[PDB]
């Protein structure tokens, strides 16, 4: 399949080269997989989601996304125009309030929610969790992310936007999950992107156009938005049978575009998520 005039990030993940605008992907498109977006919620009613998005859990007075960040990430995972995996199922877990903040314990509870809730869902191709969130180092948040990974969910987490080593942030520093940095459309490390040996992969993170609340769209930047690209890619690759939740992060790194990013500090991987689709 070919999506002309796609957002640059979708076009990048199906390209050996920057500077193209068509997204190429197998039509299976993540059908029969599921991605949990653990964030501020999802505006499930957004026409971009086509009935494939639903809120399954909230820790606040409302399950709606009053922020837009979770809606934006869900749109990059699986919205019809802005999504990597245009047919996956999206499950919203609102661990962040509408200011975008959450107590870690609510975040931990939400991760443990996903690790059980996936047994209440039909995801025969497998389960992904996109965690576009983070804060300071926490061994209890790291371990919640490792449990989620261990339960059979590919976990993809933001490296963080501090331009520092990700070892001082959680769940970024958890080694068992898939820690994602951010690149820009010129194949540069995003100026805000964390780095370090704990990063597994980079995805498009600068000026990412996706769904927003109120039925709108907008372009925003963050290792937060690189993560749903990898999360959407994992769901896509799992539907194609190319990998499993336990080995997806590593499959993605094996098959990534290698050595193409600039301003990648010594010791951090120079790998850019790539779907390797041959049209």
Curated annotation (Swiss-Prot):
User: Which positions bind Ca(2+) 1?
Assistant: 175, 177, 200
Q: Which residues bind Ca(2+) 2?
A: 16, 260
Active site location = 39, 69, 224
Could you name the domain of life of the organism this protein comes from? Answer: Eukaryota
Query: What is the disulfide pattern of this chain?
Result: 34-123, 178-249
Reaction catalyzed = Hydrolysis of keratin, and of other proteins with subtilisin-like specificity. Hydrolyzes peptide amides
Requisite cofactors: Ca(2+)
GO CC aspect terms: extracellular region
Q: What class of enzyme is it?
A: hydrolase
Record's cofactor remark = Binds 2 calcium ions per subunit.
> EC number(s) for this protein?
3.4.21.64
| UniProt keyword list | Calcium, Disulfide bond, Hydrolase, Metal-binding, Protease, Serine protease, Signal, Zymogen
Give this protein's Gene Ontology molecular function annotations.
metal ion binding; serine-type endopeptidase activity
Q: Which GO terms describe its biological process?
A: proteolysis
Residue limits of the Peptidase S8 domain? 7-279
What does the record give as the function of this protein? Hydrolyzes keratin at aromatic and hydrophobic residues.
The entry's family comment says: Belongs to the peptidase S8 family.
- Any idea what this protein is called? Proteinase K
Native species of this protein?
A: Parengyodontium album
- What high-level taxonomic lineage is stated for the organism? Eukaryota, Fungi, Dikarya, Ascomycota, Pezizomycotina
Query: Which part of the full protein does this chain span, and how long is the full protein?
Result: 106 to 384 of 384
């Amino acid at each position: 399949a070919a999506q002309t005039n796609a957002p640059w990030g979708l076009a990048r993940i199906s390209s050996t080269s920057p500077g193209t605008s068509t997204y190429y992907y197998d039509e299976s498109a993540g059908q029969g997989s599921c991605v949990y977006v653990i964030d501020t919620g999802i505006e499930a009613s957004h026409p971009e989601f086509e009935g494939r998005a639903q809120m399954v859990k909230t820790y606040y007075y409302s399950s709606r996304d009053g922020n837009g960040h979770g809606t934006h990430c869900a749109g990059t995972v699986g919205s019809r125009t802005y999504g990597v995996a245009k047919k996956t199922q999206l499950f919203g877990v609102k661990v962040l309030d509408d200011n975008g903040s959450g107590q870690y314990s609510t975040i931990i509870a939400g991760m443990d929610f996903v690790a059980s809730d996936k047994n209440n869902r039909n995801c025969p191709k497998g389960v992904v969790a996109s965690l576009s969130l983070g804060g300071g180092y926490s061994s209890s948040v790291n371990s919640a992310a490792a449990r989620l990974q261990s339960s059979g969910v590919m976990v993809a987490v933001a490296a963080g936007n501090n331009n520092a080593d990700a070892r001082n942030y959680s769940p970024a520093s958890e080694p068992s999950v898939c820690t994602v940095g951010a690149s820009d459309r010129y194949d540069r490390r995003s100026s805000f992107s964390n780095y370090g040996s704990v990063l597994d992969i980079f995805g498009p993170g600068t000026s990412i156009l996706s769904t927003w609340i109120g039925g709108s769209t907008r372009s925003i930047s963050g290792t937060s938005m690189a993560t749903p690209h990898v999360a959407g890619l994992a769901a896509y690759l799992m539907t194609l049978g190319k990998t499993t939740a336990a080995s997806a992060c590593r499959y993605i790194a094996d098959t990534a575009n290698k050595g193409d990013l600039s301003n990648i500090p010594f010791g951090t991987v120079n790998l850019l998520a790539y779907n390797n689709y041959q049209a």
